[PDB]
Amino acid sequence: VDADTEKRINVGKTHLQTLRNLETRCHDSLQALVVIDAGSSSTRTNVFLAKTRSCPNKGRSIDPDSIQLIREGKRFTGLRVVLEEWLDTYAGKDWESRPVDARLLFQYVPQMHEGAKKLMQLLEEDTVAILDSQLNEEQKVQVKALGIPVMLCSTAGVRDFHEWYRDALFVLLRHLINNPSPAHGYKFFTNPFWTRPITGAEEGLFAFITLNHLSRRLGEDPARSMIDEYGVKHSRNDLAGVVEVGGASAQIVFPLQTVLPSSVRAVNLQRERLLPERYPSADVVSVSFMQLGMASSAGLFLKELCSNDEFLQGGICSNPCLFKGFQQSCSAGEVEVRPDGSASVNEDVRKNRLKPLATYCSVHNPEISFKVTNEMQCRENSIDPTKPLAERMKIENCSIIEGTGNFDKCVSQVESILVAPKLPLPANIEAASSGFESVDQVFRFASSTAPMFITGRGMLASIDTLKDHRLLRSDFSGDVEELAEAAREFCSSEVIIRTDGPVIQLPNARGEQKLNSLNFDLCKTMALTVSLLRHMAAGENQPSFIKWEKSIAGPDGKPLADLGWQVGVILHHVLFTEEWGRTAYEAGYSHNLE
Amino acid sequence: VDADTEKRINVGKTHLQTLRNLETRCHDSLQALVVIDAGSSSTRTNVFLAKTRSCPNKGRSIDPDSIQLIREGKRFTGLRVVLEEWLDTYAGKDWESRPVDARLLFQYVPQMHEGAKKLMQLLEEDTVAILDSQLNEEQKVQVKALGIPVMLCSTAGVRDFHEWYRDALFVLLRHLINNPSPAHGYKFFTNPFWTRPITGAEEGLFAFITLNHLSRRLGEDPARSMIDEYGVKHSRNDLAGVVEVGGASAQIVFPLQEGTVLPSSVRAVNLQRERLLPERYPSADVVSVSFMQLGMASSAGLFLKELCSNDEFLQGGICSNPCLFKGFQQSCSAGEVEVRPDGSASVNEDVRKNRLKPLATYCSVHNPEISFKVTNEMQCRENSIDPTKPLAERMKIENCSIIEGTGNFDKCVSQVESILVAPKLPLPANIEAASSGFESVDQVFRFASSTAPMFITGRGMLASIDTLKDHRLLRSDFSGDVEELAEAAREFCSSEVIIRTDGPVIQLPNARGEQKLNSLNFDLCKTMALTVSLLRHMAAGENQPSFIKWEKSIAGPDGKPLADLGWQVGVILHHVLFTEEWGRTAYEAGYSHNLE
Ligand SMILES: Nc1ncnc2c1ncn2[C@@H]1O[C@H](COP(=O)(O)NP(=O)(O)O)[C@@H](O)[C@H]1O
Numbered sequence A: 001v002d003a004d005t006e007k008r009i010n011v012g013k014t015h016l017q018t019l020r021n022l023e024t025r026c027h028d029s030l031q032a033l034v035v036i037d038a039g040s041s042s043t044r045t046n047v048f049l050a051k052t053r054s055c056p057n058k059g060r061s062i063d064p065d066s067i068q069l070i071r072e073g074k075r076f077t078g079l080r081v082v083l084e085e086w087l088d089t090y091a092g093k094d095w096e097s098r099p100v101d102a103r104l105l106f107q108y109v110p111q112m113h114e115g116a117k118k119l120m121q122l123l124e125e126d127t128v129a130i131l132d133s134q135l136n137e138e139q140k141v142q143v144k145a146l147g148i149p150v151m152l153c154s155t156a157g158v159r160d161f162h163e164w165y166r167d168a169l170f171v172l173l174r175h176l177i178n179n180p181s182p183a184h185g186y187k188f189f190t191n192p193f194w195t196r197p198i199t200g201a202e203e204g205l206f207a208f209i210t211l212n213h214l215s216r217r218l219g220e221d222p223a224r225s226m227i228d229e230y231g232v233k234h235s236r237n238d239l240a241g242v243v244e245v246g247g248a249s250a251q252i253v254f255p256l257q258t259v260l261p262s263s264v265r266a267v268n269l270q271r272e273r274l275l276p277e278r279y280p281s282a283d284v285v286s287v288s289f290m291q292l293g294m295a296s297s298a299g300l301f302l303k304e305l306c307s308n309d310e311f312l313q314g315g316i317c318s319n320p321c322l323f324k325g326f327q328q329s330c331s332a333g334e335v336e337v338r339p340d341g342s343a344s345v346n347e348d349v350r351k352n353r354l355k356p357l358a359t360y361c362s363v364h365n366p367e368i369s370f371k372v373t374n375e376m377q378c379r380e381n382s383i384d385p386t387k388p389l390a391e392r393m394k395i396e397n398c399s400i401i402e403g404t405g406n407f408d409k410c411v412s413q414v415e416s417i418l419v420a421p422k423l424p425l426p427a428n429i430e431a432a433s434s435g436f437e438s439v440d441q442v443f444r445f446a447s448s449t450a451p452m453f454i455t456g457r458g459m460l461a462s463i464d465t466l467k468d469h470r471l472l473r474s475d476f477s478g479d480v481e482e483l484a485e486a487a488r489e490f491c492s493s494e495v496i497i498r499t500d501g502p503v504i505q506l507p508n509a510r511g512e513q514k515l516n517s518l519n520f521d522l523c524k525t526m527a528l529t530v531s532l533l534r535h536m537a538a539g540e541n542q543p544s545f546i547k548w549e550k551s552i553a554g555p556d557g558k559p560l561a562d563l564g565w566q567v568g569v570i571l572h573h574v575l576f577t578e579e580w581g582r583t584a585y586e587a588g589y590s591h592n593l594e
Numbered sequence B: 001v002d003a004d005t006e007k008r009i010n011v012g013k014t015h016l017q018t019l020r021n022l023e024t025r026c027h028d029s030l031q032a033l034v035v036i037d038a039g040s041s042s043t044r045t046n047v048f049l050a051k052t053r054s055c056p057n058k059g060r061s062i063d064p065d066s067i068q069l070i071r072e073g074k075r076f077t078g079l080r081v082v083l084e085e086w087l088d089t090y091a092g093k094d095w096e097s098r099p100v101d102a103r104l105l106f107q108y109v110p111q112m113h114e115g116a117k118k119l120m121q122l123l124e125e126d127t128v129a130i131l132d133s134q135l136n137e138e139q140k141v142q143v144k145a146l147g148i149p150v151m152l153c154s155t156a157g158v159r160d161f162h163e164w165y166r167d168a169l170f171v172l173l174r175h176l177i178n179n180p181s182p183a184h185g186y187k188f189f190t191n192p193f194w195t196r197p198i199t200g201a202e203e204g205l206f207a208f209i210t211l212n213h214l215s216r217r218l219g220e221d222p223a224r225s226m227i228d229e230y231g232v233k234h235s236r237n238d239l240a241g242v243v244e245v246g247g248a249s250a251q252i253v254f255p256l257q258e259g260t261v262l263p264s265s266v267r268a269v270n271l272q273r274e275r276l277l278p279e280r281y282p283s284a285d286v287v288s289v290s291f292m293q294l295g296m297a298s299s300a301g302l303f304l305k306e307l308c309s310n311d312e313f314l315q316g317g318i319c320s321n322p323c324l325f326k327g328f329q330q331s332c333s334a335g336e337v338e339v340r341p342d343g344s345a346s347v348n349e350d351v352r353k354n355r356l357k358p359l360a361t362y363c364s365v366h367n368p369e370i371s372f373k374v375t376n377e378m379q380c381r382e383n384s385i386d387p388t389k390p391l392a393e394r395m396k397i398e399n400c401s402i403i404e405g406t407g408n409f410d411k412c413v414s415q416v417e418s419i420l421v422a423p424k425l426p427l428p429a430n431i432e433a434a435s436s437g438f439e440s441v442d443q444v445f446r447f448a449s450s451t452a453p454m455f456i457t458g459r460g461m462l463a464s465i466d467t468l469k470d471h472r473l474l475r476s477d478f479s480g481d482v483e484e485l486a487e488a489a490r491e492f493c494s495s496e497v498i499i500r501t502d503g504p505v506i507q508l509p510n511a512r513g514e515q516k517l518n519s520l521n522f523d524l525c526k527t528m529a530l531t532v533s534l535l536r537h538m539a540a541g542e543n544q545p546s547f548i549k550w551e552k553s554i555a556g557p558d559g560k561p562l563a564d565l566g567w568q569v570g571v572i573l574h575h576v577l578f579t580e581e582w583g584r585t586a587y588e589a590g591y592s593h594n595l596e
């Protein structure tokens, strides 16, 4: 038995060594992270999962490569609607057309809290439902014990919001997040660093961090970086830049490979505390343009084009960005392409694409009344700030809009109205302060050889549409003339109303597609793309390559998260190990214990 | 025109980029580091060079791999002699044999400072001479601007010093180091963390850090370590242990392997927990034990005393020494030995030169460590030293006139085992070893053992193997084979001393050849016997070393050794590796902490 009992001695000795190992090693645990996207059109939850690691005498940290989106939630009320509804009730209806004493609105702070509460309860219910459905029991125990950091950030929707209203709303939003329902057991918590409005530049920087993280271009490890003989860490692969065109604004972000004019303000990632010191350094141009988003540029373009006598004659506005055979009521109201081929224009003021701009452009807004600069920017886009809201949004002496399907005239107008206007488009003090009045100035003062990624649903639909009809090659790499010739052909299509409804009939029997509420004005976006590509092509430095991407595939061939600012905002916080440990784990949800 | 000016534009753009580069990059600078070895036989300087790097917003640090010894200086007086000389003058002569009121010695602190000053001025002169001779003008500018950290550490020589004397001396030594001659421009400086006595365990730990650093076994980068799936950093190669036999003590150091079973009485050191290495370095549990009286000089004195007080060896005034060659004869004393050109051995009569002085000085009834502790008195009496007798009779080998060599290796091993390796009671001044759970060398491998490879170091330890290799008695690839070593040494140690015209010679028994008889090899057979005994004890351990190597030096990246084996590199590393603390003490406070 001295070989049998000997194996028993080694079992007992192993039991002690295993136990000793368990008390010396690092332990992994699952954490949930929540990003609330408070956008122009809606407020939506984004539920993420990440792997945390705790080591004896080293604390706890997140493995940044483990960050994965589990679900993007339902589209609830935007913050603009919350504030505008509260103003309708407490400042009275048509406060957009009258002087409002903002001081008097302070007596209605509890009522603003009640409005904000309604939205917060829906978002909490949505977040909890996603968590309950995706996690198993063991995962829920970990997720519930660690605490759930919440980052609610607002973008272009309330970026141009007047007076003190928005910032008071943020104080209320944080209080609501810090008091979740005790019933579900999920410990949601926030602070003024996680929950706040983000600037257009930050928004762009965060989307740049997301892109480079997911594509594996950004990293501090030997796989993604290299330390030279002088101790400087360089990224192994070029960091790529990003163009993101959303609903309300467009972000242009690129790392510099440089010597800049004194007027241009570039961001150093380390110096500006976006990335920790251990990460490769980069000087990045990040500029955001209000009125360049899909919805906001649609409203502005109609208003400016249909007020020019070259386009407006005897009640008819001739729109070169719209198809031949397409007709709509002369308004910036939301368009619904109906099954019968008709274009239904929504007359509800809240649904009009000019509402945000016409609301900003008011003589009762201190930004207009005290600043001639801002008034002239408004008047340059045919908005008279002295007139009531209804006439500010109205396209005067215009009954009907008719499409002419003339792509070059469309490009020409997109260039003069949106890309290279005489004055900066309104609510762009931030872009102007960084040295850029308009899109045309971006590539004139700063250019880079850094590759570029073009993002945004509409930007992608523009290329994918031309690819589907075999008008563009599947390997399209940004060729301007190739894009202009493809779009010139597609945009000269006739709109035919058939039994099966409105159809885009391509010239040269090249086929067809259905006309709908998302693609009826896609030609304006193709014109924006062409104009943008020409401006990038004119820069002293030209991108090494240009790519259009819907998503970035993870290590298993499947994307781990979406493109956008959400992953970036998480990384911006979690990468600063010490600060994150103190705020997420030391203080944590227990900071709220009352 | 446009092609040529575009290039001219590119020269201007380059001029700016070169300067942007300079103000963004890390910059390298040379620093000198000084380790003063305050050992048992002497106090000697060790001048090192290291590359420092300063990075914007990261401060300054030393590249540990750049540490190189430029020179080990002259052997000046040991701290023991400084203190005993001071006692001779202020407590009076023969204070070793009389009661001394230690309280009264406080009035002589300035005089202790004056004695210490004499030694410090010699060491400073030696250090400055080494620096002036090795550095060029650009190197001197860097070395002079950065400041020169000094680490004076005392070992076995003053480890057992009585009363408060030694610690008062350290306060004076630091003050002297912090006030260098302004003339030479080298800005030497120290503090109580760098300049202090070091325990035998620390001494062993530092020699272990040196060995593993130089051999590239110890490291924190992907080349020398690996991080597992659970975030634990392991060394890529096995960390090796060390046996170091110096002049006064011997250190035994080894890392403990996975699932090691330790009795509660055995105290192993965790490198990170005990702050020897920073957290970023692989963790290890290390047995480090030091034995006083196991050094070359101290064991020579003790061995003679014990062997020649034994009736099996002492008869008719002749002590028969089996550790000494046939035909070798000396005066019966532990006094320093000189092999003269005529073949005669002259034993030095000077009490300060007698190898028993440190032990006989410790073993006194007027030392509170003996008078209050029967334990210590019994340890002394077990080595034939009566602490009640004057110094002269404590050092004397009674009724013994002549020591004659018998060249009997097995009798030599037998005696080294009973006297030195496995004595009845622990050898005196070993409370530190005893406190860590080890009374003697024989207990080290009984209580703890490891599969960790072992390196055998020390001047005598290497001479023992190299001598047998030279006479082709041992193979060049000797890996520690006990019977092979005993067989080789038995043959070599049975050699006869022949007195020739060109001086005395060691004649090998079977025309195997010969070598010159000198003051360094006359008693080498005791060290061979110590080696054999040590190897048998390691071979008896539950876990045996993967391999045993005898090394004089460790080769650097260019085939040439960067530094010596020993505690010196280790003590530097122990401080420089803690980046933040080193930056604060060496650079933020620096030599300017001393500014008037
Ligand atoms: N298939 C499609 N074709 C063209 N445009 C499309 C599309 N799907 C969405 N879009 C456009 O993206 C925008 C969606 O807005 P978001 O990306 O949510 N930006 P924000 O609300 O956070 O500010 C809409 O304005 C819509 O016009």
Ligand SMILES: [Mg+2]
Binding pocket: A039, A155, A246, A247
């Ligand atoms: Mg958005």
Ligand SMILES: [Mg+2]
Binding pocket: B039, B155, B246, B247
């Ligand atoms: Mg020594």
